[PDB]
């Protein structure tokens, strides 16, 4: 179809606008166009054809036409990635490429690592890690050498990351002498620089794996750090930060070499150089020995306090990191911190201008929370009460975050009655006065209320006054915000035995349930869920049986969260209140969900399936199965599969004695899709019952008789999926004679191709290994184990690989090995005493 013509890139293709090398030459570029600019159904086919024939086409023309496409500026993230995927599949296919085209591809996909999104970063890493095995060590090393000498900061940054991904892919032991080359190179300055950064991204990508390799890198740090070049010296200091953080306290013995020059750099060069240096030493702090930690921390804290006034952003960010790490030191006392560090902290770094920039606000909050551990919690929050009542809304937000992360760890039990009062007062003030739309306030406020609960009652009343006050408001943002706060505060109210207050909450929310805005309505239903869950059903005001019939129309509201919380709450009434709602109304629920689960949400769809268990416990299981089986006939796969799930859960809660006979008839129905839904529903209903299927196994085997024998690879597939769960949970019951049958029908299917069929059949045979035991399952595998056919062999050695994985000692007695069978045999097997 060639959907969405690209005029410039197509006229860039030229080729056919309207001779085997001309035919492959043409069809190849035609396919490439199918991928880049084309129809989804078309490009999906051109992918399979291009990969199947990827070995046939010459990589010279493949990459010759393909690569320069990505050099244009008119590409889009969609299309560029559509070509990237072909790059990956072809490179991983051919597996061998000449060095010039290796260089071309590495240059083309090299910038991908720098893109802002980890989505592109990931595939940019994938092309390089797949190419590394293709080209090898020597090729890539010959590629990076002329590039590291480039004068372009951009490209140097690019192949820094690229070289790192190569080092991780082929190992950093093989690429390490190259790191020593660009590292220790006396020739070029940028070669030193990038040679140092490569160590950075190597440390980041390896993570903890950098330990065993940390010896060679610290050589480059110690020798190349001494360079007179300020940028070099800085980048080395950053490498110490990354390799220390990823290092974890082990590496101290190695870092002791570079430990010394950092301090003489600190006391002298100052400036941003001291920013990077204190970043490095700060990262060294956790790995320091307790005595050494004691000395060097006390040495650094003076420079920190002196540098509190730094107008620069970077230095403040570093200082916060150094305090963050030094907080864990046992040497510096919480008394020391409260007497000196903390008071000079809260006054300097909590100024309103601090709160303006988020990326700094992060480090501020996390640093403060790390301070809260050593500092007294009541002292920290004591200093944190004044920032709560400030009139700046983002500053109030940061003020909240600090309380959230702090109270989660420590809890508020340290606070006195008075400042505990001023705390909740401040939280209510900032909560009712909030201008900005953000989800944090109700979350963290709820965390505080979960932390302290019995103490809330005299505050618990006014808090709910504010709650209702916001529940009537003209802005849906504040509406759903306050509702989310409700659902969180519901469990706490139970601790004060306010239950009538929960009743009036249930009233007002139930009356506001008719709101037009879905985004708020969902949260309201969530608060309904918390209320009904917490409080006893009998004392619920509306009551429930009046609640649910108003819920039945809600299911058609579409959107998502409305059905999320709606299905959650309908399920809550399903398990909790079987009697209240009338069974015909429950049937209306069944029809509504049965129509509802076409939705694309796995949470809505899964929970929807789960509610049929409660509805099946309350109401007639056959009554549910009528609607379910009637819905199996629909062509839509989600309907078939998740109606099969519903049949499974109903068979779990009701028991298979009811559900299975009607299932078998629904299998007697001639329709394929129905039979598939039956077999899968049988799979799920078996995996949900561990000990039940043992008694039901024999009635299954005549059904699988026509299933496994059926011509359709689908029926054979899903039947094998039945044999998986059935065999796993029924293994060891003594039904092996039936399992022997079921297997005897499976063995002929081993040669069946396709990924789904082959993995379902493998898993089925592995389940049979547990129910039969290897010995017979072996006997088949043995009589087919080698064979001339080169195909039969490849097929059975898969089953024997999985068997060797699960069982080894189990197969030991069963090896058909005799002294005439093999030369050496084992002399000790024939010993008899």
């Amino acid at each position: 179809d060639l959907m969405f013509f690209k005029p410039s890139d197509h006229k860039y293709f030229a080729d056919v606008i309207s001779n085997k090398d001309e035919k492959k030459e043409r069809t190849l570029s035609m396919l490439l166009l199918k991928i880049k600019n084309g129809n989804t159904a078309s490009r999906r086919t051109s992918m399979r054809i291009l990969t199947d024939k990827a070995v046939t086409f010459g990589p010279e023309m493949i990459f010759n036409r393909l690569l320069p496409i990505l050099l244009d500026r008119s590409l889009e993230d969609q299309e560029r990635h559509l070509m990237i995927k072909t790059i990956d599949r072809v490179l991983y296919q051919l597996g061998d490429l000449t060095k010039p085209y290796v260089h071309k591809i590495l240059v083309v996909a090299a910038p991908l690592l720098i893109d802002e999104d980890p989505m592109v970063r990931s595939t940019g890493q994938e092309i390089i890690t797949n190419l590394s095995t293709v080209a090898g060590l020597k090729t890539i090393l010959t590629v990076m050498r002329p590039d590291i000498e480039n004068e372009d900061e951009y490209v140097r940054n690019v192949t820094s990351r690229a070289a790192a991904v190569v080092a991780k892919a082929l190992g950093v032991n093989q690429l390490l002498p190259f790191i020593n080359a660009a590292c220790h190179s006396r020739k070029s300055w940028k070669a030193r620089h990038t040679g140092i950064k490569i160590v950075q991204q190597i440390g980041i990508l390896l993570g903890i794996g950098v330990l065993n390799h940390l010896t060679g890198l610290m050589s480059c740090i110690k020798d190349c750090l001494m360079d007179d070049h300020v940028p070099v010296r800085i980048v080395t200091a950053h490498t110490l930060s990354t390799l220390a953080e990823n290092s974890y306290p082990y590496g101290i013995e190695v870092f002791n070499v570079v430990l010394e020059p950092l301090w003489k750099g600190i006391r002298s060069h100052r400036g941003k150089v001291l920013s990077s240096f204190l970043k490095a030493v700060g990262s060294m702090i956790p790995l320091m020995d307790p005595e050494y930690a004691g000395y060097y921390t006390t040495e650094a804290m003076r420079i920190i306090r002196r540098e509190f006034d730094s107008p620069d952003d970077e230095m403040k960010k570093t200082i916060l990191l150094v305090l963050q790490k030094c907080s864990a030191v046992e040497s510096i006392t919480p008394k020391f911190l409260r007497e000196e560090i903390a008071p000079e902290f809260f006054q300097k770094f909590w100024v309103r201008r601090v709160a303006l920039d988020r990326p700094l606000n992060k480090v501020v909050t996390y640093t403060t929370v790390t301070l809260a551990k050593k500092l007294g919690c009541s002292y920290t929050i004591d200093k944190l009460l004044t920032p709560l009542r400030d009139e700046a809304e983002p500053f109030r937000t940061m003020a909240v975050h600090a309380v959230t992360r702090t109270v989660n760890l420590l809890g508020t039990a340290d606070l006195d009655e008075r400042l505990e009062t001023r705390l909740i007062d401040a939280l209510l003030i900032a909560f009712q006065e909030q201008t900005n739309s953000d989800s944090i306030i109700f979350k963290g406020f709820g965390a505080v209320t979960v932390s302290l609960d019995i103490r809330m009652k005299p505050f618990l009343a006014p808090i709910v006054s504010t709650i209702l006050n916001h529940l009537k408001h003209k802005t849906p943002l504040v509406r759903q915000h306050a509702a989310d706060l409700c659902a969180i505060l519901i469990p706490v109210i139970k601790n004060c035995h306010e239950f009538e207050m929960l009743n009036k909450l249930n009233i007002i929310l139930y009356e506001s349930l008719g709101e037009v805005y879905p985004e708020v309505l969902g949260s309201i239903i969530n608060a309904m869920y918390c209320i009904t869950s917490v409080m006893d059903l009998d004392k619920l005001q509306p009551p429930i049986n009046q609640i649910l019939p108003t819920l039945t129309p809600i299911l058609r509201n579409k959107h998502r969260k409305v059905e999320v919380n709606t299905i959650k709450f309908v399920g809550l009434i399903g398990k909790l209140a079987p009697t209240y709602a009338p069974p015909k109304e429950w049937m209306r629920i069944c029809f509504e969900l049965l129509e509802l689960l076409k939705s694309t949400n796995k949470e809505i769809r899964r929970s929807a399936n789960a509610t049929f268990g409660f509805i099946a416990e309350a109401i007639g299981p056959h009554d549910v199965l009528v609607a379910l089986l009637n819905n199996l006939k629909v062509q839509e796969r989600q309907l078939r599969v998740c109606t099969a799930v519903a049949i499974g859960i109903v068979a779990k809660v009701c028991g298979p004695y009811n559900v299975l006979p009607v299932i078998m008839n629904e299998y007697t129905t001639p329709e394929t899709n129905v039979q598939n839904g039956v077999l899968k529903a049988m799979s799920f209903m078996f995996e949900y019952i561990g000990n039940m299927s043992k008694d039901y196994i024999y009635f299954i085997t005549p059904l699988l008789e026509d299933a496994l024998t059926d011509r359709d690879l689908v029926h054979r597939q899903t039947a094998s999926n039945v044999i998986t769960h059935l065999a796993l949970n029924c293994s060891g019951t003594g039904h092996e004679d039936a399992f022997i049958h079921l297997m005897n029908l499976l063995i002929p299917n081993i040669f069946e191709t396709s990924p789904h069929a082959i993995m379902r059949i493998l898993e089925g045979l592995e389940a049979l290994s547990q129910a039969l035991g290897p010995g017979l399952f072996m006997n088949y595998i043995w009589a087919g184990l080698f064979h001339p056919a080169k195909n039969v062999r490849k097929a059975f050695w898969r089953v024997y690989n999985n068997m060797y994985v699960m069982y080894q000692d189990a197969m030991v007695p069963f090896y058909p090995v005799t002294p005439d069978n093999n030369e050496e045999y084992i002399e000790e097997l024939d010993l008899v005493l």
């Binding site: 006979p661 008839n665 009635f699 026509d706 002929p748 040669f751 039969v792």
Partner: protein
């Protein structure tokens, strides 16, 4: 048991010992055919399904018509599987080395085994 294709067995002296070992069950012979193991003409004439008579006693056959609501007693169904059908077992099953080749149909052999029983 050894066959002409065993000549190209890369380790024929070994493969003969394994294949001819006591309890091993030779590979199903539908390999070397390209028919994907089922082209069977007999597959066209296979019955869709038949309920096990014990389950057919449950009468849901009449309650729901599968061929071109339905509530039943819990005690009835439960007893059919357990009280009535505990000792019940499928009549055919298969044996240690039984392997199902494409052209095979078990049903005729079931009526056969049952018939060797009744008729004397």
């Amino acid at each position: 048991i050894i066959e002409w294709y065993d000549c190209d067995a890369r380790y024929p002296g070994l493969l003969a010992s394994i294949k001819c070992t006591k309890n091993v069950i030779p590979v199903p012979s539908h390999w070397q055919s390209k028919k994907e193991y089922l082209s069977g003409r007999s597959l066209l004439g296979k019955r869709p399904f038949e309920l096990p008579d014990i389950i057919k006693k449950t009468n849901i056959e009449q309650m729901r018509s599968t061929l071109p609501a339905l509530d039943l007693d819990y005690k009835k169904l439960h007893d059919v599987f357990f009280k009535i059908g505990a000792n019940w077992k499928p009549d055919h099953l298969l044996c240690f080395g039984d392997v199902y080749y494409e052209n095979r149909n078990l049903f005729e052999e079931t009526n056969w085994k049952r018939m060797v029983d009744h008729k004397r």
